[PDB]
């Protein structure tokens, strides 16, 4: 039953009540309730698929059996020193965290480890959908094979921004696959590229 001073959000819930009335007495006079219960259930479905936890001073981000540990130091009110440790994912993620830990830029670190796990789950369920949908077999996350042909799946970074884009390679030919993924789309194209060539 706590009345929150948020004070941006309260200036917003008022504004567009007022900005649509610029079209010619719309003010709230009432403040929202706060209940930690729902607030948590929301922060849950935003992390969904991954847990955040804290053993001071470090704060762990974990999707099963993977741990990205961020130890952070703050001299009020500003961050100073950030440091990081991973497992098994050092290489795949390396380039973006070169940047992150090098600027001591925190959210770039996190949001990139989040979206890497998401591009990894996307590829893994993309490769499942391909293997059972045709004659293909699997080696690791990276690769699938049909006879003499090897198609790799994995992410690259445009170094500034934490959002990875996907890169589907193969032993040559490249021009051909790349275009059958664009026109016919990543699954139906990589199915088609396992017929012609």
């Amino acid at each position: 039953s706590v009345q929150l001073d948020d004070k941006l959000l309260l200036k917003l819930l008022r504004r567009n009540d007022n900005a649509v009335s610029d079209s010619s007495n719309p003010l709230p006079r009432v403040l929202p309730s706060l209940n930690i219960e729902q607030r948590k259930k929301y922060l849950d479905i935003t992390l969904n698929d991954v847990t955040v936890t804290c053993e001071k001073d470090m704060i762990l981000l974990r999707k099963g059996s993977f741990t990205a540990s961020f130890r952070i130091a703050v001299e009020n009110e500003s961050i100073r020193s950030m440091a990081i440790d991973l497992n098994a994912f050092e290489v795949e993620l390396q380039p973006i965290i070169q940047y992150a830990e090098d600027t001591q830029n925190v959210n770039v670190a996190m949001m990139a480890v989040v979206q890497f796990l998401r591009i990894k789950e996307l590829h893994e369920q993309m490769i499942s959908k391909i293997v059972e949908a045709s004659k293909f077999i699997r080696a690791s996350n990276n690769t699938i094979t049909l006879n003499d042909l090897e198609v790799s799946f994995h992410c690259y970074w445009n170094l500034p921004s934490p959002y990875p884009e996907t890169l589907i390679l193969t032993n040559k030919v490249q021009k051909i696959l790349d275009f059958l993924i664009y026109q016919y789309g990543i699954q139906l194209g990589v199915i088609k590229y396992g017929s012609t060539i």
């Binding site: 959000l9 819930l13 009432v30 929202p32 309730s33 706060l34 209940n35 930690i36 729902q38 607030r39 948590k40 929301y42 922060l43 479905i45 935003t46 992390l47 955040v52 936890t53 804290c54 704060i59 925190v106 959210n107 996190m110 949001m111 989040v114």
Partner: peptide, 26 residues
Amino acid sequence: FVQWENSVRLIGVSLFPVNYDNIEFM
């Protein structure tokens, strides 16, 4: 709780409830 909430929120993107007695915005 606020240590955990400020932690998560760092990712830069966050979901949180605006709660009223008869409605809840997202």
